Symmetry: C2
Subunit: 375 residues, 2 copies
């Protein structure tokens, strides 16, 4: 049968930054209060973000201890790696233990592990660290998805679908764990596009169990993964780039990203849903990577979505910020919980069919067709 | 049906270094001729490497233009990335075009792309670059496997097996492209394990087409991918580590690494071949990642392999050195070419079943069971 999501959980670092207070904090800790016009631009970005709070393992204490991270382009990759490479699997384990609990099986039944992060590469990778931290079988079949950015929450579902459907009895643990350690940096009027990241990026981890052929005596499906596609957008090359450099991960925006995603998203919908016979985009539930707020606004306008279609996606953005690959997985967690609390008929806001979108560098759109389960 | 390898090709940079001359060249270009004790240790390492030559895109001209790369721990990641991120997909495209030719189908029939490298991370990744360089369909389903080291040539086969067997009609292009740009550095008596890498690592790219259900009117299988396993070796934590730092990729080795692999290899063989009813390791053909030559020697001795079992693996090591993930794929290409040239009965040295091993950080062993095809 089809790959099925059997459990979801999440974790965030305990320190959280209130967005209303962030322009003042960020310009203070980076010693940039003299850049008054830049501070005003950053305040506007923070207020436009529709983020209320973000969780960050980067604290004032840590930044004071790593002052090269507070420069715009300080030589700082080593300092960033030293923090992030430990944090990434630690936060991932926090989510994974809880997903395993919901799943209801012993962890010795996990046959496959997908780990996903853009927060720092190491050899061996975070997949190895998580395997040892959790005490998974040494024979777990691992896939380490590094540096794929904000569409990778859909990528891991696409990968998990083929792994679990091609291997009878297989059960995949998926962990996505992201943080701002590689990207945090001081401001510069050269690199205004970096301020976008400073206003949006946040920390979080999400874990899932995916498997085909559920054991109804123990396992409880949440969503079915029907199809998974990936495409590059025409003429979009260079719109979003992220470079791993001596100063950490630097972000570069060169084209109108929301215009590209909104102009092309209907093609992905038609390709995904024509085989199903669906053409009304308000008749399906939506999980859309929300880390670019203007992207969601323009998708909504272009397609004529009702204002509530993206409610769960915008709620996660409001409460957590742009956690990169983890966002869409937080959104699935939020949707099923809200549907249960509100007495909706399915885990997809009472609807049967749904779409999950990852958006990221390429420009790339990942399109996952889901089906809900009854509540 | 089973996933099958339908085509293989390879590519190397034109510049090559003769191993017998390398100690003198390396110590001169790194301005380290005064480290006379270290130079003799390096000559012994090169003499014991059983490498005759290695291809390298890093030329004398480039090293003279990038002097911080010739220091031992010079701040040089940016210079390395500037070189490697263009070289990786360029060399990969060279191999991919030739693999596509052998396959015999138009490149519009490629539905999936797996790209693998440890030579430098970027967003978007080398998979995106290769897709654009080759003019693949924008809807190609990509998987980017970054920084998994020397076992990843087997990893890509494990991944391709699930992708192609779960998707009717799918055809996956696999590209592995590796180089010494991130690891090349001057010598130091505080980091002797780095010398091992300077004696062994080399550049190369290999490309494959993999698919299930071949069309016998156009396609010609070379190998069948029967099973693919991965395991961590007991109590091997920290034996091989690779860190991505301001000075590039730095390598760190405990000294009993060959002992770990040779002492555990039989478990991987028993686990893979018991379902097939095979216990005689001389009755199967071998593709063993050859990048540690004591690994090959100790495996041969521990298992009592015939003197010629590792012939193709040692030949690739001799002519190309340790090209990380690409080695095992060069070895498959060498085996089928030599079998045809020499009138063998199958693409597996006249034998029917074979094993392909990837070895790398973890410590990880990847075990792929293959079947040959008649010639």
């Amino acid at each position: 049968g089809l790959a099925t999501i059997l459990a979801i959980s999440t974790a965030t670092p305990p320190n959280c930054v209130i967005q209303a207070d962030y322009p003042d904090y960020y310009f203070k800790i980076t010693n940039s209060e003299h850049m008054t016009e830049l501070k005003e631009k950053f305040r506007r970005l923070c207020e436009k973000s529709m983020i209320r709070k973000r969780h960050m393992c980067l604290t004032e204490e840590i930044l004071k201890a790593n002052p090269n991270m507070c420069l715009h382009m300080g030589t700082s990759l080593n300092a960033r790696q030293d923090i992030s490479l430990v944090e990434v699997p630690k936060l991932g384990k926090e989510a994974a233990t809880k997903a395993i609990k919901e799943w209801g099986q012993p962890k010795s039944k996990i046959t496959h592990l997908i780990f996903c992060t853009s927060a720092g590469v190491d050899m061996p990778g975070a997949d190895y660290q998580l395997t040892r931290l959790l005490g998974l079988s040494p024979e777990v079949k691992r896939m380490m998805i590094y540096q794929q950015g904000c569409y990778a929450g859909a990528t891991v579902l696409r990968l998990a679908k083929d792994l679990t459907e091609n291997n009878k009895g297989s059960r995949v643990l998926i962990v996505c764990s992201e943080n701002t350690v590689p990207t945090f940096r001081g401001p510069s009027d050269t690199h205004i596009d970096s301020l976008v990241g400073q206003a949006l990026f946040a920390d979080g981890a999400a874990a899932l169990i995916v498997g085909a052929d559920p054991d109804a005596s123990i396992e409880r499906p949440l969503y079915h993964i029907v199809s998974a596609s990936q495409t590059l957008l025409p003429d979009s090359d260079g719109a979003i780039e992220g470079h791993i450099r001596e100063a950490g991960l630097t972000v570069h925006l060169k084209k109108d990203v929301p215009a590209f995603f909104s102009a092309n998203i209907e093609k992905s919908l038609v390709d995904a849903f024509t085989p199903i016979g669906i053409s009304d985009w308000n008749s399906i539930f939506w999980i859309a990577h929300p880390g670019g707020p203007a992207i969601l606004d323009q998708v909504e306008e272009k397609l004529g979505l009702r204002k509530d279609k993206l409610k769960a996606s915008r709620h996660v953005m409001s409460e957590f910020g742009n956690m990169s690959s983890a966002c869409v997985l937080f959104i699935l967690d939020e949707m099923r919980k809200t549907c249960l609390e509100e007495g909706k008929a399915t885990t997809g806001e009472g609807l049967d069919w749904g779409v999950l979108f990852g958006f990221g560098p390429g420009l790339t759109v990942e399109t996952v067709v889901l089906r809900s389960v009854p509540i």
